[PDB]
TrEMBL record, chains C, E:
GO molecular function: DNA binding; DNA endonuclease activity; hydrolase activity; metal ion binding
InterPro entries, A to Z: Cas1, CRISPR-assoc_Cas1, CRISPR-assoc_Cas1_C, CRISPR-assoc_Cas1_DVULG, CRISPR-assoc_Cas1_N
Family: Belongs to the CRISPR-associated endonuclease Cas1 family.
A Gene Ontology biological process term: maintenance of CRISPR repeat elements
Task performed by this protein: CRISPR (clustered regularly interspaced short palindromic repeat), is an adaptive immune system that provides protection against mobile genetic elements (viruses, transposable elements and conjugative plasmids). CRISPR clusters contain spacers, sequences complementary to antecedent mobile elements, and target invading nucleic acids. CRISPR clusters are transcribed and processed into CRISPR RNA (crRNA). Acts as a dsDNA endonuclease. Involved in the integration of spacer DNA into the CRISPR cassette.
Subunit structure as annotated in this protein's UniProt entry: Homodimer, forms a heterotetramer with a Cas2 homodimer.
Annotated binding of Mn(2+), by residue: E166, H234, E249
Keyword check for Signal: no
Cofactor dependency: Mg(2+); Mn(2+)
Name of the gene: cas1
Listed EC numbers: 3.1.-.-
Keyword terms: Antiviral defense, DNA-binding, Endonuclease, Hydrolase, Magnesium, Manganese, Metal-binding, Nuclease
Pfam families: Cas_Cas1 (PF01867)
Protein name: CRISPR-associated endonuclease Cas1
Automatic annotation (TrEMBL), chains D, F:
Positions that bind Mn(2+): E166, H234, E249
Family: Belongs to the CRISPR-associated endonuclease Cas1 family.
A GO biological process held by the record: defense response to virus
Record's function text: CRISPR (clustered regularly interspaced short palindromic repeat), is an adaptive immune system that provides protection against mobile genetic elements (viruses, transposable elements and conjugative plasmids). CRISPR clusters contain spacers, sequences complementary to antecedent mobile elements, and target invading nucleic acids. CRISPR clusters are transcribed and processed into CRISPR RNA (crRNA). Acts as a dsDNA endonuclease. Involved in the integration of spacer DNA into the CRISPR cassette.
Subunit (UniProt): Homodimer, forms a heterotetramer with a Cas2 homodimer.
Annotated GO MF terms: DNA binding; DNA endonuclease activity; hydrolase activity; metal ion binding
Source organism of this protein record: Halalkalibacterium halodurans (strain ATCC BAA-125 / DSM 18197 / FERM 7344 / JCM 9153 / C-125)
InterPro entries documented for this protein: Cas1, CRISPR-assoc_Cas1, CRISPR-assoc_Cas1_C, CRISPR-assoc_Cas1_DVULG, CRISPR-assoc_Cas1_N
Protein name as it appears in the record: CRISPR-associated endonuclease Cas1
Amino acid sequence: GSMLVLITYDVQTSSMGGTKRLRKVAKACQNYGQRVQNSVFECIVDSTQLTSLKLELTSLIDEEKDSLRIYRLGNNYKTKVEHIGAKPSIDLEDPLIF
Amino acid sequence: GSMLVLITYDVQTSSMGGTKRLRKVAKACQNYGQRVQNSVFECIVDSTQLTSLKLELTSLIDEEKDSLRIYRLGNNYKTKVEHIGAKPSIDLEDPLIF
Amino acid sequence: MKKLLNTLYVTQPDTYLSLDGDNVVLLKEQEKLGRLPLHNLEAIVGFGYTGASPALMGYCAERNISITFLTKNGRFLARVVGESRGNVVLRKTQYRISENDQESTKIARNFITGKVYNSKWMLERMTREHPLRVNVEQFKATSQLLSVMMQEIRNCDSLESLRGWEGQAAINYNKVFDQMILQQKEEFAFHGRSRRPPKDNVNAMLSFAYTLLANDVAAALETVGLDAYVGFMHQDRPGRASLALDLMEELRGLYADRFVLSLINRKEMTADGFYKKENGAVLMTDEARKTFLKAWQTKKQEKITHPYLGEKMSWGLVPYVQALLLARFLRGDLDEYPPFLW
Amino acid sequence: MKKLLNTLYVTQPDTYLSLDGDNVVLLKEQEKLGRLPLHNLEAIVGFGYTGASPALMGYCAERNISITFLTKNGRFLARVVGESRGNVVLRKTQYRISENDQESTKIARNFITGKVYNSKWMLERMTREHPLRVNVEQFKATSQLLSVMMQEIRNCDSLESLRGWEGQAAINYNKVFDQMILQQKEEFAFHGRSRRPPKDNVNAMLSFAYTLLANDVAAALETVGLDAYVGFMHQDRPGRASLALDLMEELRGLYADRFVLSLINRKEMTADGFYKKENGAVLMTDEARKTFLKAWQTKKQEKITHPYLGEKMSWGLVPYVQALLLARFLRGDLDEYPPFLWK
Amino acid sequence: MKKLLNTLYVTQPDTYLSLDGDNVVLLKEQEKLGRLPLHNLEAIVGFGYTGASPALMGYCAERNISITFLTKNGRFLARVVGESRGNVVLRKTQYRISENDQESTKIARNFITGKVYNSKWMLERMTREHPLRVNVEQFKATSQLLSVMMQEIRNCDSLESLRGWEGQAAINYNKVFDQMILQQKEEFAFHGRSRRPPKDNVNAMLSFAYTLLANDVAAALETVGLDAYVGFMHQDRPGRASLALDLMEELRGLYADRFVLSLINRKEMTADGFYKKENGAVLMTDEARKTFLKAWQTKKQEKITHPYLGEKMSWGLVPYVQALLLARFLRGDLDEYPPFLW
Amino acid sequence: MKKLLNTLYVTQPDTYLSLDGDNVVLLKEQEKLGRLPLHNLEAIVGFGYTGASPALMGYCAERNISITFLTKNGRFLARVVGESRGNVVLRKTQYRISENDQESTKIARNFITGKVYNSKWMLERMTREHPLRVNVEQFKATSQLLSVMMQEIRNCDSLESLRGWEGQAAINYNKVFDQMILQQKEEFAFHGRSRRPPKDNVNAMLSFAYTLLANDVAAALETVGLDAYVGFMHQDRPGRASLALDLMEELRGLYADRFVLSLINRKEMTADGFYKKENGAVLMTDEARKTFLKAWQTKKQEKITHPYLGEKMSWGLVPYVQALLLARFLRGDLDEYPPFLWK
Amino acid sequence: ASNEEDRYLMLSGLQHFQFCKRQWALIHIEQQWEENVRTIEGQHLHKKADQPFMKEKRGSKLTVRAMPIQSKNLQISGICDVVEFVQDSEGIELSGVSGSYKAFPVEYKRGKPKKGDEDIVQLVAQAMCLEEMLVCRIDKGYLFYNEIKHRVEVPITDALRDKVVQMAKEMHHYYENRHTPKVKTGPFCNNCSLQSICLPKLMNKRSVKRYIEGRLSE
DNA sequence: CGTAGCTGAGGACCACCAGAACTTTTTTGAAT
DNA sequence: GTTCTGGTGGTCCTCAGCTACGTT
Ligand code: SF4
Ligand SMILES: [Mn+2]
């Protein structure tokens, strides 16, 4: 499979445990994908990892105070993504040699 | 086609004229779409309006200093979006009875 | 090959429409209710007392977006009309074709031919699905006599004749309309198409459908650059705004009466959704209005096939194409207007 | 504001319009600046980034009143009206008269008579104002020549004769205009006239004044219901607002060239703002055009009296009102169309 | 049925592979060079002096993410191997079978049969598409030699006989392997085998291909559940990945040296890249290494159809599914192990 | 720090490790703490979050020395090997021996003799220690019985007979066990064994200890390469580490029961930390469980002597060293498996 | 067999044996496991709904979570998800509290009720298992289906009990024989989480000899 | 009223420092 | 060497606010 899935979060740090929630969400979401811009990640996952990540984040955040969006591009993502600026992202399908 | 594309920006405001670039970029991007999150818009366009927006937005930012990403989903976008938090987004195919 | 665009309905009173770049924003005492981009709208409709920023009216008028104001029961008021955009030869042709009874009676021939065809064939269809409820025989009866009138309408050369025949199609169909209903007949005051302009129940939805269709067809025609609510076919009498809807007299009987009948038969509207004033006027509840508008948009979204070329087309484009073809006939490329025949 | 002509000409920017009972109220930043009735009005023209109270819009729409909205300067924005009234019959009459040639010849000869009257009287006043160093008898002889030409134009019957007798006055006016200016005569010249990309600074600034009057007259037509692209004397052509050009030629007198001489004289404009790029082009400098537009607005604020109606007004309302009378000609209330004429 | 996860080659020296949650991070004197999610990897290869934290190896061992260490030329310096899992049925079956010489022959039959079929079919593919370039009838003669010999190998009974026939086939195939330099100069002329120093070219690429294929076969076999250090054939020299060699004896011919020949004949590599020390055998170059690895990982994503299982699967999975098709044979769901007969 | 039988265990946490010349060097934040020659080592076993040094990793992997990295509490993390991997002939020998009765019974004899000796000597030691609170006659009678039973088990040759003798020894020790407790008998009374859903307090405690010890012994085996799931006395079934249960018989008593009785007699805990279940089952509280784990860890640092070799070492290395000897039995110069005969 | 108390099989095996007689073999004999979407959801629900060390009562009834049970008659041990005790002078007093309570087993799952027996069998074992420890008679069961969030009663007769006994006997025989059988595959192995292991495809195809001989002759 | 340009006033988001620790049984878990 | 919890500072981001104006 290896479908491309994009995750964006947005937490509120004005409440009692705002910083704790932000730290935990950033750590929990960095485990599956990489970071392209602040508060957005893009990952190449199967269906099962997507379900597991969704369940983890849903359990970790609190509702009615945070926001989380999950988009999926299908399996034809190479012709759907366009980048202009100067914050390049490492892709995970090329030879990937350091 | 009238299909959905997602636009994200990331412009630094610590540089010489960063504040002006941020203001102009946000104002230019808000015209063609809807703000779902801080620095994240989504919009429904054809090919021609998308080309116009890309050409307009390529000049306001400056390369080697900023970041800008455009993702393109397809014509069946209703089944490729999930929302979990508390920042709901208005859909433009809903009858819109204000 | 054009694509349909959305429409925005405003029901909250005492709001305010304002422009910002290419976005329309709704305010009420500086409280931003929401902003919508204007590059994917086709029209804007407002209820109650809502105002607009003159910059917004200028923007919409320039970019072919129609603003319309309404009141409580779709009582039409204050359409927004722009300017003259060019293609002067087309207007020259249309202005020459008028005031000449030969071409006028040709166009009237085709218009009323389409109307009669739609009415007859829809009645036959309805008697074809479920024959137990009504009497097939009499229905079939009406059919052939309308077919009779069809031959007559094709052998016509004078406008003054067709008006008379109108009455026949206006009195040989009403006698069926009261039998059109199936369910909830006793509750819904159902005196057929016996109508009263200040509204007397089971006509509120009918008038609402007529008003929506008239505004839609007016916008669709003005996009191409001609005005036909009192034009070459319809009478010169002021205040009888029907020719614009006579271009949709192919559709006035079909797309509005059919919608009302489908809602009534599908038991989706309850009699508690209406009320009457002290004097006797009849109004619709707000939730019922929202239900009607949701149903209207959902129906307008559904996608069908056009008879001409079969390219797969949507319902909201039915008026627009009927305008576009009327252009190509006036350019002399065709022979006579092909109406919409279902 | 409310001229005898049944229109409303609210021109103060950042005003507001609202409804009180059955009357209109002009609010000037939250106090009752003005109050007018609606019983005898027919249309409302509104300048300036403003609004209208939705109650006023609803009250105007029903009783056959159109609400036209413009910018402050005079560009056209939008129109609000219900079942349209007073446009279909007017435009159809416009096109019908455009078809025939007799009425077109009559109207064109009326316009040319107006233009020749204006220019002749302008020369009369010019030679009276400064009778010290000027060829008085030459201007008198030109005056008699144009008087005879005015009589001949009033005695015209065909388009070809009208065009021939119009073309004659152009060169005479060119020479006399070059001789007209008083100050800075050595510094600016008008030996030759060019409509296409111009040579000489004066010709280019005439072109700019013509463009401004062009936009103004186009909006003037659009605000009443008439067309733009079919004319009476000028023949129809796709993309050319022929009626606009006809009215331009009618009003090319006091409203354009007097402004030219005023800018040239009084030392209000200098040669540092005018340029040259390989073809005589006068590239207007940004400061020069800023001053030009400010002077144009200031002149538009100047008060005058209408020769026909007699009511005091601004210069900026001179075109629209004039054009509006054209409408009252096509509605059958007028026998002719005198812009500046004795009759 | 898997996804053919990616693979990480780190070449820059003096790095340090650290772990942060599920991320592998490359540190270098506190400077961060990058981080990768560890659910998108299969193996991680290190070059030169690259150290690993115990937490990282402990995390990678339990999820079948293999870690390998190489000095400069793909030596077997050090790998990582995890614990043993509780699947005693397969391991008991394998040990008992390896204790029986007859079953050893009944498996080595299929191994060498697949090998010789690979050799013959690839030789015929090479002959039929190349005209005056090659000696055609010598290739043809070797072809019927191999085709007749395969049937005799299929009916072998003792290990020594099968070893003899394997050696015969090996020499009779190297005889014509020496013949492919189609589109490159003499510096790529095969002239025999040197074991420890790659004293020539061609060897300097075949060694790299063989190391990178062994380190994949071993990982697949230890993933499926078997133990990969006891074999169905070869002399059981202690402490050598004998089963890996056995299972590679089939895809070596069609998956590694075919790749090197394709690389050379396409002129994707130039003789200027290689160099030599005072003796130094032959050492590849950093850009040369990058090109080799890029072409390798690019070819490892071609989609084929598997002969027996009849499914459309990627190239790199072949050394895995084969091993899995081994496992079920041990449980008796087949008759005998089907080798890869591309 | 300590080298036992050609292996090197680094038990203190947070001590980096590297290579110098041809020797191993321990470090603790840039402080030279130990230097050891690598001429005659056979393996390296780490316990800290060290990471070793890549130079030494390459050096050992080249010189046929494998490395095993654990955690400080004994869990298995990783094993760095080259081509050899070491345990192939050893694992084959285990698998071959696992399917014959004679050798399996021999090794079972080796285990059980150690078990009974440890039990008997502990009984006699407790008789000697405390006079007043003891039925001395019962313990001495059971001691004689157990001595005869050990002498008999030394000469067993069939699995069923050895199983029966093991059962009888278990019955004897269990019928002796209850009066061993000398404090807090109000709810801490032993009256049987019920491993699955343990009942009535103390039983559950015992079970927990076994589990920990088993896991420990399990990791011990994986240090050397013995396949933890194919036993010798216990028969193999999937999901259970049979050989660990075979091995941990000799260490069960002195190392788990002694610990539990020390906790009970020293009033290290009270019954308030055990919760109730409806069918009579008993569970442990999180605080009580953590105290138990901490006490186990602290006891693991007690320093004793080795009965068979003599080096003074901690308790925590007893399961590993014994396991190492087990390995040296499978392929080595060992005459017979040496049990942990500890007085 | 430590004391005959070790040769016990988990109750989780019964549902697997009922569904895909190969699946139980793959899980409980080769000791391997693989998860997909539905398995992840099931495990997460089971883990979240697991709240030991707490009791919930309503004055009349009592509820217990994670109830350890075993039965010597079948040699089957396991953990009951929920046990509900009701108050009436009919049953057996139980350790810990006062009064007399009757027992009802409750096991949650994730999915629509299945046309085959399946789940029922597992639950039946629980009930019968409980009769050995709480020495009573049990003739009722509860199933909760969280995909519909519905609850279904389950009666027990001699038919179900004899079927369960025969199933346990056959399962023990298969385990003693270390043998993994073959079944009729069809379309159920499209969500069989072990589809990358049990390989339904090779169960129907030709023998190996024919393919090798087929590619030998040509 | 709309279009720009300057401020400021708080939140969101993330990278560095600093400190104190670091071990847990056995069974359940999908199939339109 | 990890992992979790605090503390600190520095930069993106959107909104509230005050000034200065609208033609080519
Ligand atoms: S084919 Fe799949 S679903 Fe069927 S028994 Fe085997 S593993 Fe289970
Ligand atoms: Mn359950």
